[PDB]
Amino acid sequence: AKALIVYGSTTGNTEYTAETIARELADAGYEVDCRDAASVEAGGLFEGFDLVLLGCSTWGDDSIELQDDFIPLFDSLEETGAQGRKVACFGCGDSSYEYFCGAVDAIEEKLKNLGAEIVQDGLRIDGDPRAARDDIVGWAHDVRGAI
């Protein structure tokens, strides 16, 4: 199985989450490519992957704002080869805000409307992902068991 993980992270929390997921998938035998959204180009990005995991923190407070490095990829998701692609989403946030992990919502809906197959409900991390490490591991298992 070949997996692509693409994350947007400002303070490193979604990046930690991405790397935790990456390690779980690699340890199970997947080929894993884990990239910062700041470094990627949208066109054809998902081609050749069995599974694509998109991670993004939520910003904005009074409105939903995607993590800033992820916005160009989000605005170009139509170019990535998402139709029929097996995908799932993750991200960090804080439930004291009105739109908790709203970026995960936004990315999931955009993917669904592009024809992607959402294989698991998104991973919505409240607070420090290091305090949710076992939820991350479990979700990574669940995703492997759903493709």
Ligand X SMILES: Cc1cc2nc3c(=O)[nH]c(=O)nc-3n(C[C@H](O)[C@H](O)[C@H](O)COP(=O)(O)O)c2cc1C
The distance of closest approach from Cβ of residue 67 to ligand X in the complex, given in angstroms and rounded to an integer, is 5
Of 81 and 129, CB closest to ligand X: 129
The distance of closest approach from Cβ of residue 13 to ligand X in the complex, given in angstroms and rounded to an integer, is 4
DSSP letters, 55-76, are EE-EE-SSS-EE-TTTHHHHHT
CB of 32 closer than 8 Å to CB of 5: yes
Among the listed ranges 7-15, 21-29, 44-52, 80-88, the one in contact with ligand X (CB under 6 A) is 7-15
Token digits of residue 141: 């298992």
Of 10 and 76, CB closest to ligand X: 10
Spatial separation of the C-alpha atoms in residues 142 and 116, rounded to whole Å: 18
Residue 10 three-state SS: coil
List binders of ligand X among 54-93 (CB under 6 A).
57-61, 67, 92-93
Q: Which residue is nearest to ligand X (CB)?
A: 93
12 binds ligand X (CB under 6 A): yes
In b/e form, how buried is each residue of 32-44, taking b as 16+ CB within 10 angstroms?
A: bebebbeebebee
Single residue of 25, 101, 116, 140 touching ligand X by CB under 6 A? 101
The distance of closest approach from Cβ of residue 64 to ligand X in the complex, given in angstroms and rounded to an integer, is 6
Angle at 10 (CA atoms; ends 31, 75), nearest 5 degrees: 75
Which parts of this chain interact with ligand X (CB under 6 A)? 9-14, 57-61, 67, 92-94, 97, 99-102
